[PDB]
Subunit: 389 residues, 4 copies
């Protein structure tokens, strides 16, 4: 019944890098337009825009709506943002599918968007500070990467999972290197080109078109990897090298009923067969995808074995290993072109980013059944099953 | 099909008043447990918590999850925040309804929370400021009350509607006084008591139980109203007395299929017959409710005259009069117990706040059909039709 | 040789009290004009204005010149601030006297000024914060009250003194309550009137004339002093009751040669007979007045027993008790009208504020020889000897 | 009677340059140690350290003492900062001289220090900001470079001087470029080595020794200077090319009586014969060196024509040309090694920076009579005459 007509994501920017001063909605605008052009659908025909975005402090009222207008979706349409942290990008798409499934909408653009670079520092100062220093809080750290119940960073959560699953430093380092190697391979081979819509960084002293994921590291070594110090646990195992990065970007999908696509001449990228969200203990939030993936499969009537391709977000090597290990899916069909450790992890947009990767990879290799999953801070997982047409 | 088993809202506090240092997720927690308690449903049976909240900057990862966990909802359920500005609160209920309608969940707690008081000041400072002064931005104003397209305040958008609908000062002032008198009248007769769930302001030198809307003004006079100066247009017509306030508050609804409610021996507050969202010109966003209400009515198969009760959000006197003027519904059945001008307007929670009043008034006066509607910044409207059982 | 022709001070304001929003140079301006007027000296005759000031951040270019200009001092004269912390206001008078002694000026207005209440919060942001929270530093605490060598407050230096000299809590509390009772008695008998020049806080909704020290507590009790908790060492002895306060004010003197006072028929408040400044260990900075007063007396050719009156600043009861114990001067001739624990401590102005208190009490009771001394953060003392004529 | 036994300065850093994160007091300690070492004078013989500094906000209690303590000056000595804006570095040396002249000290270290790069942004937040955006004030701009009476930059006072003296854009650029070429040539020839003491910028990933004035531009061209846009008056004449820069550095002199230097066998850098400080109209502050230099010469009993070398600070080429036009001294003996447009202008230290330049050049060419003079914000000048021994 509901299909993904088309899809597009911007390249993934490094932190304070290519998109350093670009407001997320800008990145979103371009993705909204791309999905529209790629399916031959006019912005005028868009009923609603849903955009997962975790850190919009100071970007003004509802960046989703600013993105939609910037891209030309008429003012008669609607737009909103939502936040299930890292599952935000994928959850948006589910939510948008529900919009058409309940008959409240016909065509929706959904995904996520995030400028981690542009997230401001803040302080509650209405009462006034009579005396003494006060903290200016980094909303990126506090609102997107800190567990709100234990007060520690996501990396600590990953350390909890490493210990629990007995995942050594070498084994998390081995996984990251492979991730970099696969992503680099993919990039050289033109594998990210279909899904990427080039973004124009509007300059003054010149415009700069970005069309390549700049965080991927070329020639990543195991030696350099092994020399890094633990980033969260002083005598820990998680490093800057075996953990995803801080990044900016946007990604989305054009959804509509299979019938509608059919009436249009559009050849969909896939049919949303099912999706699932489930909670877990915040301390081991990286285990989130296990239950969520299984739930989604259950709802689709699929067996783990039925999958031809998987995209399981790499928040941290230790959680990614745990997930694969538990689920037992064939490593070889997971993150075929690299994962977040290489490509980057723009919080609110990462679920839509990985959906794009999955979707263009299923088309190119002809795979039939695919699944995208992500772990979520606070103890949750989100998964989506897709079947090609 | 989908019914609101129960509901509850906190009292609405004034700006920097009783809830001044209360983070929105603490009020959220209170309301979520009330709804459970009220329906006789254990925390453990909740599948998901959906909370609209426009100003979470500084509160930490996904405040919706923090509310859930604090209220006893196990780590297995899931939670997420969403923003559709003042439409958030109501929109969330519709989204939860859809969670059930598509068989993705059985029981959902939905509504909104907001702490305007706790909204921080911010500035983007990763790039550094090499030389010169910079502005510390009030996130409540930028991210909550400032049009992102014209850069002006919602107040000005109200002025645009005033001029366009030729709504004099005296006319808006009249409207304001009435909502105060009506909000004061209802508070005096205990009309808000079923909906309110007392909130314990955890103190040090004393704990304070808040159970009354502190923002309503007793004995509002027209003379005092007419002596106030325009707050947005220097030679304008909108003032602080005929505009909504800056407030704190949380409100939520417990949703489940009608059959499920019957399986549990619950007497529902009503069934959600339809809902709708439509966009309009951002300049006159106050008109929001006209197109959305009509749509909602159309989808429910109801006529304007079928409505027994109506709750149409009092963002500004100007917009409220324009809404009622155009729709034509009998004034006496609209905001019978006062509106946001007197009660308050905790942006992300308001849509669920006005559903609570609609819901408990419909039960108390035995009205069968009702409609809640709000105007949304950026030019949008949200509407929902509820029928008692 | 060099005399003090006249002097004046403003009443000392409470933290965030009467002068909460009054920049220091405005207080300074009134005291430069009272001094001129009190001596029969016109502003066109001033050569230079010298003002101690420790916390001028955010006030603009050289506030000493802003105060001199506001008082009508001609643009041909010059002005400069200096900073020897609490010894500033007194040390300015000694540097003004040297301007004259070396023949480079004939008429100087010297003293201090401080708005502790207007000191801002700051942060070094030129390089930017790539990520993580940063502190907004309270310039009053950082630049005015925190030792830069040990990182702790001036109050801890007082705890070091309390321990080393074995001053109990009881004795420190007895000292602070005699301070209060003495200042209150002098206030009620009109003893502060000659020295206070009234300050007009320019309002909008009314101008307020402040001519009374508002920090002096009336009816201070030993019981209330004794129940206060230690302010700096959780199991310390220094409290808010037995410590000076954070205050605002300005004070000054008009200086010229004795021969010049004599050509003008002026009856000077005193002859500056000597002064001195010496360092001590920062950890016990509060003992500064010992060596500085001993040095000043030696330079004057005076024994301690020759003094008729003393003003030794009350930064903290502990340190004032140690100075008194060590020096051995008759306690009934020291701070006869109360001192800083009751009157307050506007850091850069205090040295001139206690010099005003000495001069007007020496003229009142006919005391021939006096001495004013103050302890200084970072381990220093300053002291000056005055003889009447 | 009072001689400068030795002197030293650090190289001048570019804004956010080599000493971007080096607090002034660390630069000042290196110069205090250098004057001592240069004269055969041990740190335990020092009575007082006097350091002009206009921007100490956020550095902690009295940076002059911090500098002194860091250099090994005993805690029994004293230290203070003072501020007469750009004349501060030179005024401190006259101020040190007066301490010996009056018998209150035997050995003084005086000069100035400044980290314009380390100057913070601030806001008065004690009273609280109920709502709205507020300004984070650049203290270097506000407290160091803006006139307090007219509210405009020091550069607009340079435009006023330009119009009034009818100094064209061409004349200003030609002086600027001659400044750069003369400093490049003295740099390359090694004439700045004697005066400069190398500064070790403590690294983490390497210590860096800074011993060269980095602001100096090599190969400055008239053409690129001519193409610059006006920086303060949109259709003005003062540009970033013909104005001084924003810089970092420290500079000092070690003083003692002539008799004392003779007892020690010290061959002093010169005898302080007179100094003067005079005010002028704040709007044409750049003219202050005129009256101050004539006054200093008159106190020395010298004619302008008796001078063999002059250092006249280059706040802006417009005022520098005005000063040279009025005084009429031979331009060939003024700033023979370039000035502040090329070397840089660390406000609090500049006075001493140009006095080291003057002294070391008088020693190398055998110049007997010299003068150092600087213009001061707020309408003032300072100047000092020096005679070789
Ligand atoms: C791990 C983390 C704290 C690193 O932050 P950081 O210390 O500022 O990171 P950096 O990139 O500066 O790491 C330091 C260095 O490691 C190097 N490095 C990183 N990956 C590397 C690799 N594969 N090989 C070699 N060097 C590598 C960087 O290049 C850098 O070099 P430098 O110090 O010379 O500049 C951060 O990326 C983070 O919080 N990431 C996301 C975690 C997260 O919770 N995401 C949400 C999902 S739950
Ligand atoms: C109108 C608005 C700008 C007022 O802000 P403010 O100036 O800080 O408000 P205040 O409460 O201080 O108003 C000042 C005065 O109005 C007075 N006032 C308010 N309502 C009054 C009434 N009905 N009768 C008499 N006086 C009244 C207050 O008592 C106060 O008197 P005071 O000077 O002694 O305090 C603000 O409420 C606002 O932006 N509101 C929200 C509107 C909005 O855009 N909502 C989003 C939905 S689209
Ligand atoms: C001591 C100090 C830290 C107190 O700061 P604070 O805690 O914010 O001060 P407060 O004024 O709130 O004192 C706390 C309370 O003690 C009470 N108090 C103070 N003196 C009292 C007395 N004599 N009797 C009874 N109560 C008294 C105050 O009224 C207040 O009551 P509250 O809590 O009901 O408001 C501060 O004044 C200080 O740092 N002072 C000295 C500064 C210094 O070093 N200056 C330079 C010297 S080198
Ligand atoms: C004039 C002033 C505002 C310039 O600040 P800014 O605009 O940020 O300055 P910059 O140094 O970045 O701008 C100079 C620009 O012209 C260039 N420039 C400067 N001097 C040049 C020269 N001599 N030849 C060629 N180009 C030159 C700079 O390289 C820069 O080019 P860029 O932006 O491509 O990198 C600032 O240096 C100043 O306020 N100086 C004041 C000194 C003062 O008032 N001190 C107290 C004195 S009373």
């Amino acid at each position: 019944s509901i299909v993904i007509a088309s899809a597009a994501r911007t390249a993934v920017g490094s932190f304070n890098g290519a998109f350093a001063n670009t407001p997320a909605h800008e990145l979103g605008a371009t993705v909204i337009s791309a999905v529209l052009e790629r399916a031959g659908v006019a912005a005028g025909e868009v009923n609603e825009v849903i955009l997962g975005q975790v850190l919009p402090a100071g970007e003004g009222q509802n960046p989703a709506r600013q993105a939609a207008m910037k891209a030309g979706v008429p003012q008669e349409a609607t737009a909103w943002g939502m936040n299930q942290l890292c599952g935000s990008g994928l959850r948006a798409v589910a939510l948008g599918m529900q919009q058409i499934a309940t008959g409240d909408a016909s065509i929706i653009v959904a995904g996520g968007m995030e400028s981690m670079s542009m997230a401001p520092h803040c302080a509650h100062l209405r009462g006034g500070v009579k005396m003494g220093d006060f903290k200016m809080i980094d909303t990126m750290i506090k609102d997107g990467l800190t567990d709100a119940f234990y007060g520690y960073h996501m990396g600590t959560t990953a350390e909890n999972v490493a210990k629990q699953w007995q995942l050594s430093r070498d084994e998390q380092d081995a996984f990251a290197v492979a991730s970099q190697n696969k992503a680099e391979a993919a990039q050289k081979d033109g594998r990210f080109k279909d899904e990427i819509v080039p973004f124009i960084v509007k300059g003054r002293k010149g415009d700069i078109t970005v069309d390549a994921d700049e965080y991927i590291r070329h020639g990543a070594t195991l030696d350099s990897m092994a020399k890094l110090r633990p980033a969260f646990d002083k005598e820990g195992t998680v490093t800057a090298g075996n953990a995803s990065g801080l990044n900016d970007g946007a990604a989305a999908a054009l959804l509509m009923s299979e019938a509608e696509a059919s009436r249009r001449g559009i050849q969909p990228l896939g049919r949303i067969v099912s999706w699932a969200t489930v909670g877990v203990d915040p301390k081991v939030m990286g285990t989130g995808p296990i239950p969520a993936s299984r739930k989604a499969l259950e709802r689709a009537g699929w067996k783990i074995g039925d999958l031809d391709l998987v995209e399981a977000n790499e928040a941290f090597a230790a959680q990614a290993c745990a997930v694969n290990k538990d689920l037992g899916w064939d490593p070889s069909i997971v993150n075929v072109n690299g994962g977040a450790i290489a490509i980057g992890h723009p919080i609110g947009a990462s679920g839509a980013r990985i959906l794009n990767t999955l979707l263009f990879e299923m088309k190119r290799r002809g795979a039939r059944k695919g699944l995208a999953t992500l772990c979520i801070g606070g103890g949750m997982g989100v998964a989506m099953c897709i079947e090609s047409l």
